[PDB]
Each structure stands twice: as structure tokens, then as C-alpha cells.
DNA sequence: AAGCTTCCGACCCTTTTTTCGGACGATTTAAAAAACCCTTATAAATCAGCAAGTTACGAGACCTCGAAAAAAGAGGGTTTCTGGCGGGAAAAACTCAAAAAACGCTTCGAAATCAACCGGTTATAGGTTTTCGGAGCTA
């Protein structure tokens, strides 16, 4: 089955129990907040080994509903993007 | 006159100090015993170096007992080091709950993509050098 954030909390807490469990979740949800905020402010998120996690742009377009098929105008906007770093790349490549 | 209380004399018994006598030791003096001297020509000892045979004194050894010293064993005590148990506070699992947040339905058309190779970006592993904190110290 899949791992979740709720399961990360406990597994980190087992492999780093010497830190307070709640200092751990505190840390971990603040650091997710930090990276998401960095994206929301239009910034890189670059690291080594892991990879880099970044932003991309979409131009305005006339899309419209898969259900109803009714014209919908859309303005230009940004979206997150992620490229895996060659260390993680090869770790996940069986 | 009677009863109670307090001295006083008589005495009984044992311990402590003094005096006297007796005994023993030491010293002195006198008496007794052993000894020294004076007469001897003749008999026996003196001694010379070495051999041949013997031993009185020394050395070695062991035992025996007793005592002395040392070592062990015992007992008295104090200081401290550790372990077990008990108790309060914090953490984190456990239980209870909502509200988001994701997922699916479901996308035809818009990105995402990998591939190889160049130059360029930059997070940061690693190392290098240095303020802050604490060492307590001392009255």
C-alpha cells in the first residue's frame, strides 16, 4: 500500500525518536508550508541528489467542461513541477 | 511523772601502724690448720729432632623445648556506592471528530518527454576559523 504524511510522521518518529514526536510533526508541516510558500512566491526549490522542484506557466485558453462541454475562459496561471534528481532517479529505477 | 531524744560509757571485732625480737647476712677478730724454712750427696729430671701412635678440644649436626614475632582471624565502627522502589511530570500513543483535501468520473487538446552534448547554475559536503558559554575561582 501507499505511504501517507500521517504515516511519515510515525516512521520518522521511530527512526528519530530522540527528537520530540511533536517537534517532528511541527517541523515537518512547517517545512512543507515553507516549500509551498516558496513556490507561491515564485521561487526555485533546488537541492542535490533529490532533484529540483520548480514552477511552470500556462497561457490563457478557452477550455470547457468534460461533463457539459460549455465554454469556459481561463486566465494565465502558474503550476508546480518536479524533476527527480539522478540519485533519487536511480534509487527508484529498479 | 512519762515519753522522746541526745549524749556518754562499756564492749566487741577487725584492720593499720609501731615496736620489739629473732634470724640471717656481713664483717671483724681470734684460734686452728696447712704450710714454709733450715740444715742434703745421691737419684732423677732436664732436652737438644724426628719418628711412630693416640687423643682433648673444636666443629658439625640435630633435637628439644620454650618463647617471641608475625600472621591470621575476629570484632567494632564509619563512609559511600549502588540498587530497588515509589512518586510526579511530560510525552506520545490512543480515542474521538471535523474539515478540508484528494480521488474519480473523465477529459481532446495542450504539455512532458527523453534521447546527447555543449556551456552555465548553485546547493552544499566538507573543511577552516572563530564568539559564546561555561570552568569554576576567590572573599
From Swiss-Prot:
PROSITE patterns: HISTONE_LIKE (PS00045). One of its GO terms (molecular function) is DNA binding. Gene3D superfamilies: IHF-like DNA-binding proteins. One of its GO terms (cellular component) is chromosome. It comes from the Bacteria. Keywords: DNA recombination, DNA-binding, Transcription, Transcription regulation, Translation regulation. Belongs to the bacterial histone-like protein family. HAMAP family: IHF_beta. This is Integration host factor subunit beta. It comes from Pseudomonas aeruginosa (strain UCBPP-PA14). The gene is ihfB.
Amino acid at each position: 500500500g501507499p505511504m501517507t504524511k500521517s504515516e511519515l510522521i510515525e516512521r520518522i518518529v521511530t527512526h528519530q525518536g530522540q527528537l520530540s514526536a511533536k517537534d517532528v510533526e511541527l517541523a515537518i508541516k512547517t517545512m512543507l508550508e515553507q516549500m509551498s510558500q516558496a513556490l507561491a512566491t515564485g521561487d526555485r526549490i533546488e537541492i542535490r541528489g533529490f532533484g529540483s522542484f520548480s514552477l511552470h506557466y500556462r497561457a490563457p485558453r478557452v477550455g470547457r467542461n468534460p461533463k457539459t462541454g460549455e465554454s469556459v475562459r481561463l486566465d494565465g496561471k502558474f503550476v508546480p513541477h518536479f524533476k527527480p534528481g539522478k540519485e533519487l532517479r536511480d534509487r527508484v529505477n529498479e
